[PDB]
Symmetry: C3
Subunit: 313 residues, 3 copies
Amino acid sequence: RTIGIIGAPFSKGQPRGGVEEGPTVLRKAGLLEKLKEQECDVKDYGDLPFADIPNDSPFQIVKNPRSVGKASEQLAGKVAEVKKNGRISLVLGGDHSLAIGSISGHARVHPDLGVIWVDAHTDINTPLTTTSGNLHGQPVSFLLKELKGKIPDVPGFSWVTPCISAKDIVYIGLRDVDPGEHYILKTLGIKYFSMTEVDRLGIGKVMEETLSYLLGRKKRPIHLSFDVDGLDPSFTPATGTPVVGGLTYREGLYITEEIYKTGLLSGLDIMEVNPSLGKTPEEVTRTVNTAVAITLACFGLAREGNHKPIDYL
Amino acid sequence: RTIGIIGAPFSKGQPRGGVEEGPTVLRKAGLLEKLKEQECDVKDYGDLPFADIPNDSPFQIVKNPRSVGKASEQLAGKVAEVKKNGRISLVLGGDHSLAIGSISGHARVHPDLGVIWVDAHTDINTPLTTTSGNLHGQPVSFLLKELKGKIPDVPGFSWVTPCISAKDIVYIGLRDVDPGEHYILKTLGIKYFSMTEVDRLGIGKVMEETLSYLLGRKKRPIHLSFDVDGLDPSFTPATGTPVVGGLTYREGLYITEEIYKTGLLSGLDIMEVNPSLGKTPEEVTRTVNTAVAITLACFGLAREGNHKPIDYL
Amino acid sequence: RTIGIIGAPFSKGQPRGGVEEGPTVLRKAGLLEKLKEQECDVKDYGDLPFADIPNDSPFQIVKNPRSVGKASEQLAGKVAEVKKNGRISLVLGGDHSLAIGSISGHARVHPDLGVIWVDAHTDINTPLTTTSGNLHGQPVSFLLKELKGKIPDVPGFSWVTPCISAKDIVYIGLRDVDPGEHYILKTLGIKYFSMTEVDRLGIGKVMEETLSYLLGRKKRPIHLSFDVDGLDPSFTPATGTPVVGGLTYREGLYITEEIYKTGLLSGLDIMEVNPSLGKTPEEVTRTVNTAVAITLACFGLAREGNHKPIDYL
Ligand SMILES: C[C@](N)(CCCC[B-](O)(O)O)C(=O)O
Ligand SMILES: C[C@](N)(CCCC[B-](O)(O)O)C(=O)O
Ligand SMILES: C[C@](N)(CCCC[B-](O)(O)O)C(=O)O
Ligand SMILES: [Mn+2]
Ligand SMILES: [Mn+2]
Ligand SMILES: [Mn+2]
Ligand SMILES: [Mn+2]
Ligand SMILES: [Mn+2]
Ligand SMILES: [Mn+2]
């Protein structure tokens, strides 16, 4: 497929800095070259430079609101530009707050998009429900139209217009959901497959239902926001908020292989890879390796094999 | 839910001593505080003091019969007392021989109970089939009415009256069953899902069928006897008889989440946690952490999230 | 069941030497004694002595063609002899190129055989599609009747006559398939369950369909060629070409338990165990332990338990 890569070396959605090295380590892993080794037409739109906002005091509990809000504003622009050039946006994060900008800019071009959110967390705290104040745990609240009425005017975010409905998103992988987040889930009727449903149904039925849920009525472009902590920390240890009992490497690949097969992948976030948090060099390479793998699957790399349209015999 | 905690620091059902520290390490992990953090009304009935029986020579092959038999006699009493106060008995072991006392005292109050036994082993050796002589591998033989005729009068156990039928118990997790135990399984028509059935059906169908099997005819209180070695040693390494190829952490939580949802959990054993056997400090915390997790799930903690009956928005 | 063990200490199908120690380490693990502990009638046909072919230069890209071709010629003979004595051939490898000889000699006695190939790889490169030149990645091309027309006369292999059709083989476990191999798969209509299908269906349905596929029309003897790298390297690390995201230890046992239950297991290869490649002593024992386990399952050892035809009570 045809891809537009955008690096988002940004960390101010949470406390730990190392996540701004995500684009660097993924690139160094050979992400671009590997995509080209596939059937892929790849344009690198470069790493976004996120200007310092040195004056950025908390809004109530919410931390670094202006830095976070600007970075997403910049990113939305960049994504919209790549979507206009007919390319699948590939955002290398960076913390998950960047999801506000990536989905936003994506929906500017394709308002009918549907979102699949792979994550141990729902990231749906409002600035009023959050207890941490970390904006990487709130991006979904800023995007949901139904929640427009419970989001205060947070400095840095006046540019935002909620662009998805509670029924345009499916979560997969949930296993550490805050109480206010759970309340929002059940109240807005959000579709989710927590680890419990994955256990119950198997990842096969999960993907069946998820795609049926989003694509049933009609075909529409897909946005996959992949938080690497959605996968078990035995595969992606170098990440800020690891939770045990995650999706397996195999489930990870299955999800993305199935998404690729729809032919409707339109936007992709690979988020929260933080090399600094690897207890060892191998934990770092293990995490980065898994991240590349998930990404390659999104763009056609299949476990059964791939071949070019020729006669190999 | 409403819980009555009882510590059973007892080890004489098997050779290794460290298992009598189970209640201590689980308590230190924050078990009680965490239960209270949930919707839980918790009363701690304390650690049972198991008086020394210094004169306790083998009965044939059977080791420490009087100590084991007394500890279970004491425990049955304690459980019956907590069942009378309208509380879910939570026995922190301690080796699995304590199951004789816990189920016994439970059935005194609720004779119509059904048992779910999560374990790598069937624990159904008689004093005549056992080759080890370790009573933690025999508790089920002492409780089955059908086996009353093949249990010799073992000193310490004259107080016991078999209280469950072959058709009131379901095993989940089996993967190291002795030949005599397998003979008993197939002869008495015992319902089991070994690791093979879990592999074949998926833990979803397993729980479906297990609950359907026990609750089909009518609702009745549930006794969950959970041997931590039911789970793979990659999750619960600090245990006396680990067997590879176990239930995953996720399957472990799925079982207990589903049991919680029945609303019929009546008695619970968390057994065979032995800190002394952790090859490292982290193996010890890993085991204890998993044990708490399984327990919290039994009393309502859900992977999809929990919220109080209020409007979080 | 009734077994004829044959050691094949052979490595010239690939670069690393340690794999010729496979028979030694498996024997030292207690394989024969453990089989006898089961219901098993076991005859050891010894370790085949594979004479040096010091003059064995590449055929085009293909390495050690004469050594590989001779070893398989010798092995086919040995297998046919054990099949004539009414025994299940058990070939301890050794690299997977030996599969050419084992299936060949097997089919001499039982031409209607069906093959189950458990592996991360398809091993179906021709001498013209291979890029590595390693013959352990080509054995299936030498055996398929449909490919007879695309196999050059490679020195050492004039004795070979393709003995299976594209529709007599099922792959399970695939996750690193070369492009030419994938082309062959889809062109010849080969039945496979890659890790993707295992993820989608569950190992239960996979085995259901695999056996239905091979045994549907009529009963026929089964050849299981098991490459230990079919399993995840977290279980079988000491092997030449490990690929992450493999079959679990549990799936491994499930496959073989189900195959045993058909009562049609006729030939078995346990291949690619290489002690030299264990990063630690425990990685070596871990691999060998898993290999024995898979083998024991093939010959009746069940996770639910086994008992002799007697009254244990
Ligand atoms: C406690 C937490 N829910 C954690 C959010 C984690 C964010 B991530 O990794 O992007 O999913 C919060 O801060 O609101
Ligand atoms: C060999 C064995 N079957 C082991 C029993 C293990 C007891 B446990 O951990 O409570 O399940 C025996 O001693 O009878
Ligand atoms: C790249 C590879 N496909 C690897 C083959 C591996 C062989 B094994 O372990 O027996 O499956 C090739 O050499 O043709
Ligand atoms: Mn997360
Ligand atoms: Mn996230
Ligand atoms: Mn046990
Ligand atoms: Mn037990
Ligand atoms: Mn292989
Ligand atoms: Mn192979």
